[PDB]
Amino acid sequence: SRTAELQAEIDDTVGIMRDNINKVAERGERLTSIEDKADNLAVSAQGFKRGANRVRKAMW
Amino acid sequence: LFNDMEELVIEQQENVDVIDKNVEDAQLDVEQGVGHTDKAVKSAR
Amino acid sequence: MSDPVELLKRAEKKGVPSSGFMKLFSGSDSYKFEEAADLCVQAATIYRLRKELNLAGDSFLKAADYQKKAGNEDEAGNTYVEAYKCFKSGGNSVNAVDSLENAIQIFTHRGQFRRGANFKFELGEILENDLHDYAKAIDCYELAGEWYAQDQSVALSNKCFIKCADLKALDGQYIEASDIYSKLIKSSMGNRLSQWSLKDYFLKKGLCQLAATDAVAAARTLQEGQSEDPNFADSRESNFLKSLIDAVNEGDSEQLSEHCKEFDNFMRLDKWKITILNKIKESIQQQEDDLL
Amino acid sequence: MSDPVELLKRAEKKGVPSSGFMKLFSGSDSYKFEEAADLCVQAATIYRLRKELNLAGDSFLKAADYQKKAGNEDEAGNTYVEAYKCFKSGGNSVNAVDSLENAIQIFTHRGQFRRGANFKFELGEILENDLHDYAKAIDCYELAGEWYAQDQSVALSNKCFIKCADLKALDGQYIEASDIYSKLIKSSMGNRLSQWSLKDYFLKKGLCQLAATDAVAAARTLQEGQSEDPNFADSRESNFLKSLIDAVNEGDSEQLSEHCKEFDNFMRLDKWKITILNKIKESIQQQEDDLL
Amino acid sequence: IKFTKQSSVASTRNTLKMAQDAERAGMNTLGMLGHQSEQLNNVEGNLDLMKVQNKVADEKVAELKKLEMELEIDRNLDQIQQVSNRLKKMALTTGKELDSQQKRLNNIEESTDDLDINLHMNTNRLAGI
């Protein structure tokens, strides 16, 4: 009866952790998208800095 | 399946490094930009 | 909504460079190409909303060409990536290949080795799965792995080099595949996180060395792995590779097939291992046929 | 493409500050260094494209120095990170270390203790693996973990403390390493994610205190582990630590050797614990030398 | 009967080994996820500060424009059960932590996109001044 209980527990962990695999796949997709958008964010921040600097020089 | 999960996390380390670095640079660049617009507003007045 | 055909016609009209006497009075043509690109982008967006994806890709290609003519190469690379997305979702793998080649060229020229490696990898995927151009896919994966290795991306480098080694071994290039596996092994030593790949790695290396009929190479690889990685020493993979080497040295193809079945029962042989193992069996059988 | 040597020469001619009379008529030198830095960065990207990483890193260092002279400290830090990238990818650990030191000083000077700590950890790793500078790598890990505690990042501080105590214990400094293990125990106590880490910590602390001939100290460390951490109470680590304490209490080196063997039998032992336990046995042998 | 017992002993040995190795895999995964959680906490803090700075930028730009064998089987099963309990806890754990980080990464995505749009808007406005 012990070995059967161990088998059942292992099966349940297998199920939980297959769901974990699916979740980490979703997480990897999300992280790739966030990397792309943060590259966009950094480029935009640099552009905003440079434009603000150019306006600062313009009014000076 | 542990192994595949763990490998996917391997790959995701660099995603996390790049997000931290890029968002840091973006925050710093915007801080400089907001400083520049503050000085521009000061000069225009 | 505007008609995308009219947007493209206006883009074409504006994209004509200043020729002759008018060039003395016209400013930089950069500006004109910028609006030709903007009009093409608008047409591309309207096509994308209509799910006319291949046309959207074509419009993005035109926009990227005009952006290149304007000197805005970074925008051109981004628009090539957009044309790529449209083509890939549209099932037009050839134009998708072309878009990534252009985009990767722009990115590498701008020192963005990271982005170029990402897209070189995706391009290799399209070549492996959709177009079945395995050789230039091998080239793609090798170069992407090199770019990742320069960036100290051990992991993405390793993913590319796994794929490169697998495709090389499937293409009969067993020695070079074994060498890439040697590099991958050397990169995965001492990293707690990768040891599972490491066992797999040793096995594959030996298998290629058995497909090249160099059983001595398989033996030294297996001894090496047994000594440098205790987890591999006691593993099923090490024992299986011992057993395959023993079968190969004996010239007993049946014993090899028995060992393959035994290993299969406990650890499913994926398609790649089946292919290489079948090659090894065939080399054995050919040797008996010559000895007979 | 332009010749990078010509770009560097132009930057070097342009790196000369105004001196004397023309300083009274020449504007701020910041623009001039900006031009030199742009030229050096361009040359260095070119060098990077030809895989000449060391020259690219040197040009990055030159550009970072010029940008420091220009007052753009943050861009200088980014260029130092680039110099680090090309030096470490180039196999030159010393110049990569120099870039890391400059970058860390820059980041700490700007209030970015986070970047300082991350790059201090990278610096300590490089020292431990390539240059075998153990003491200075120990300091790097300690400082990184301290700044991480200042940044409220529990995990980074915990990891840095683990390697810090590891290096300190292996280098003969048992008491301080055990103290850092006490810090690790306290910081990791009550967290379900770091449970396993704790299970190890108690053992490591006891081992370090036992290498310091303080048997009562390993005894209290074990008793603390048993009473405070329920999982460690039933853990094989607790039993191994009590048996080590018992063997050294008896001064029976044979019994100690046996317990090392059973501990290896179910859980393969790591070089850190082997070195510490060898030191404990050799302390039994030094005790033996005293015994005459 | 003896051979079958030997086979059982060997199989329990393998089970205990590779179970322990699975324990390791999950453990380092969890430490790694905590590390990346801390990094994402930093990302979130920077995004919040950036939102505030973009509010300031909005107002400034607006004004700017205005201006023996049985026993071994038993013991190996004992050890396997202990490890398996620890494995189950780890699996439930990783599911939970991935869920929380998934919601966090989502919010990070929209926040980054919004900041990007706002910065592009302000840069376009500054271009005309």
Residue numbers in the entry:
A (entry chain J): 27 to 86
B (entry chain K): 213 to 257
C (entry chain H), D (entry chain G): 1 to 292
E (entry chain L): 433 to 499, 589 to 650
Paper passage:
After fusion, these bundles are disassembled by the AAA+ (ATPase associated with diverse cellular activities) protein Sec18/NSF and its adaptor Sec17/α-SNAP to make them available for subsequent rounds of membrane fusion. The disassembly requires multiple ATP hydrolysis events in the presence of Mg2+; as few as six ATP hydrolysis events are sufficient. The side-loading and side-release mechanism explains how Sec18/NSF can disassemble SNAREs with constrained topologies.
We chose the Sso1–Sec9–Snc1/Snc2 complex (referred to as the ySNARE complex) because each component of this complex crosslinked with high confidence to the D2 domain of Sec18 (Snc1 is highly homologous to Snc2). We prepared the y20S complex in a nonhydrolyzing condition and, after single-particle cryo-EM data collection and processing, we obtained 381,591 high-quality particles that yielded eight three-dimensional (3D) classes into which models were built. Remarkably, our cryo-EM structures revealed that Sso1 is loaded into both the D1 and the D2 pores because the Habc domain of Sso1 interacts with the outside of the D2 ring, with class 1 having the most well-defined, discrete density. The three-helix bundle of the Habc domain is then positioned outside the D2 pore, where it packs between two small D2 subdomains (protomers A and B) in an interaction driven by charge complementarity. Indeed, the electrostatic potential surface of the Habc domain forms a roughly opposite that of the bottom of the D2 surface against which it packs. The nucleotide states and the arrangements of D1 around the substrate were also the same among all eight classes, with the ADP-engaged E protomer forming the top of a spiral staircase of tyrosine residues.
